[PDB]
Amino acid sequence: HPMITNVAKQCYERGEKPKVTDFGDKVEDPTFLNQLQSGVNRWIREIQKVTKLDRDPASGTALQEISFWLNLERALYRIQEKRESPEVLLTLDILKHGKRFHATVSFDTDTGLKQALETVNDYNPLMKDFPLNDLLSATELDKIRQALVAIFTHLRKIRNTKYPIQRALRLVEAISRDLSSQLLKVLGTRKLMHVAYEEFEKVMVACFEVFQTWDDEYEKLQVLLRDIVKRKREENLKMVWRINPAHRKLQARLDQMRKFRRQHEQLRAVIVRVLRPQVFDAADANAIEEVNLAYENVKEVDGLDVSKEGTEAWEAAMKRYDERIDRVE
Amino acid sequence: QLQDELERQQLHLREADREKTRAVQELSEQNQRLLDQLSRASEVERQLSMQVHALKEDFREKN
Amino acid sequence: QLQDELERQQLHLREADREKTRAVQELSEQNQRLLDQLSRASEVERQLSMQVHALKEDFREKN
């Protein structure tokens, strides 16, 4: 309100903090009190717009999650600093002196500012350091594994906070989605289809090392979370996880890749051993070129496509290759 | 001659830890499936008991 | 020194087996209890279902 500003600058220029008495007859003015009442209503509505903010855990990346929570915490701290400023305290004091306890009690209670402030204070140490940014930056499977262990330690930080177990789990699927994205990006970059089979096996060994590290550290955090729920057994009752990491399909996809090429390579070697005459039947070259053409046909379908169209194209390629190998079988 | 045997007991420790983890996870999953089915059955029983009570009241009135 | 850690590893394998056995027994009893509770819920479901079906038959018949 302009009036409180004018009286406050007058009081400060007189080297004294303002007081209710300085308003004199204005303290009992009806219209001035009504204006302050409406102003406090606006303040309460604005504060409730910020305090009541809530984010769906499932939607968006964990990077978006950390940004949301830190931004909300900063906003609440700014709001709290504004709230403790002499202007708002003076306004509440004037309204109290006018017995207009509606606005004052509502501001002290309806805002919920203390509760949101406590919530973000509880949530700060868990979100203070997270390496998901570094993981998204990381471009190597070993770097990815290092990032995973760092992430799971900063998730172990949860034990001394009030973060809900469900929301932490949804954060974990957010980690899964980011991990799947980065693995897809790396394996697309290196073009695993056209490279030598041996280094290809090495890279997939690295990938399965990464998946195993994910599973092991998830198990560690899972026993930790069960212990935490035991410690708060009376408070929280919903332990249901039903975790479905996004990369899991991709893991299975990559699993298929390995066995496929493995069988293919082994089978390829065997047929090359057997069809050689005891030194050249045309049927032998027909079978060999048929196997090679089956491999090339399978190479037409991208291996990294996990979507439904990817699934159906992959299945068609596998049935085709299966028949082609059934001939030589 | 005994050092390798100690390694065998270390291997057995790792094997038993893996087996225990698998078994306890499997039992937890079975437990949670049965809890979900228990909740579903409890909800069904609740709605059907509501229907029982409403029908009995209707039947008194119509009698 | 090998005896010292070897016997300890043997008896600690036994001890880990003790905790595994306790956990498996507890989860198995919880599984059996939840199976029994689901069976009883199914029984009450069936009784309430024959009740409501006969009650709706009675409703349509007295109607």
From Swiss-Prot, chain A:
Localization per record: Cytoplasm, Cytoskeleton
Q: Which pairs of positions does the record mark as disulfide bonds? A: none
Q: Which residue windows are coiled coil?
A: 246-269, 311-329
The record lists the effect of R55L as: In SMALED1; slight increased BICD2-binding
Known role: Cytoplasmic dynein 1 acts as a motor for the intracellular retrograde motility of vesicles and organelles along microtubules. Dynein has ATPase activity; the force-producing power stroke is thought to occur on release of ADP. Plays a role in mitotic spindle assembly and metaphase plate congression.
Anything noted about its domains? Dynein heavy chains probably consist of an N-terminal stem (which binds cargo and interacts with other dynein components), and the head or motor domain. The motor contains six tandemly-linked AAA domains in the head, which form a ring. A stalk-like structure (formed by two of the coiled coil domains) protrudes between AAA 4 and AAA 5 and terminates in a microtubule-binding site. A seventh domain may also contribute to this ring; it is not clear whether the N-terminus or the C-terminus forms this extra domain.
In which family does this protein belong, per the annotation?
Answer: Belongs to the dynein heavy chain family.
Indicate the disease this protein is implicated in. Answer: Charcot-Marie-Tooth disease, axonal, type 2O: An axonal form of Charcot-Marie-Tooth disease, a disorder of the peripheral nervous system, characterized by progressive weakness and atrophy, initially of the peroneal muscles and later of the distal muscles of the arms. Charcot-Marie-Tooth disease is classified in two main groups on the basis of electrophysiologic properties and histopathology: primary peripheral demyelinating neuropathies (designated CMT1 when they are dominantly inherited) and primary peripheral axonal neuropathies (CMT2).
Self-association state and partner proteins as the record states: Homodimer. The cytoplasmic dynein 1 complex consists of two catalytic heavy chains (HCs) and a number of non-catalytic subunits presented by intermediate chains (ICs), light intermediate chains (LICs) and light chains (LCs); the composition seems to vary in respect to the IC, LIC and LC composition. The heavy chain homodimer serves as a scaffold for the probable homodimeric assembly of the respective non-catalytic subunits. The ICs and LICs bind directly to the HC dimer and dynein LCs assemble on the IC dimer. Interacts with DYNC1LI1; DYNC1LI1 and DYNC1LI2 bind mutually exclusive to DYNC1H1.
Q: What is this protein called?
A: Cytoplasmic dynein 1 heavy chain 1
Q: What is the lineage of its organism?
A: Eukaryota, Metazoa, Chordata, Craniata, Vertebrata
Query: What gene is this protein a product of?
Result: DYNC1H1
Q: Which residues of the full protein are shown?
A: 210 to 561 of 4646
From Swiss-Prot, chains B, C:
The superkingdom of the source organism is Eukaryota
What is the disulfide pattern of this chain?
Answer: none
Q: Where is this protein localized, as stated in its record?
A: Cytoplasm, Cytoskeleton; Cytoplasm, Cytoskeleton, Microtubule organizing center, Centrosome
Tissue-level expression reads: Highly expressed during early embryonic development. Predominantly expressed in kidney, undifferentiated neural tissue and developing eye.
What's this chain's function? Acts as an adapter protein linking the dynein motor complex to various cargos and converts dynein from a non-processive to a highly processive motor in the presence of dynactin. Facilitates the interaction between dynein and dynactin and activates dynein processivity (the ability to move along a microtubule for a long distance without falling off the track). Predominantly recruits 2 dyneins, which increases both the force and speed of the microtubule motor. Component of secretory vesicle machinery in developing neurons that acts as a regulator of neurite outgrowth.
The text of the family note is: Belongs to the BICDR family.
How does this protein assemble?
Part of a tripartite complex with dynein and dynactin, acts an adapter linking the dynein motor complex and dynactin. Interacts with KIF1C. Interacts with RAB6A and RAB6B; interaction is specific to Rab6.
Entry protein name = BICD family-like cargo adapter 1
List the gene name: Bicdl1
Q: Which residues of the full protein are shown?
A: 179 to 241 of 577
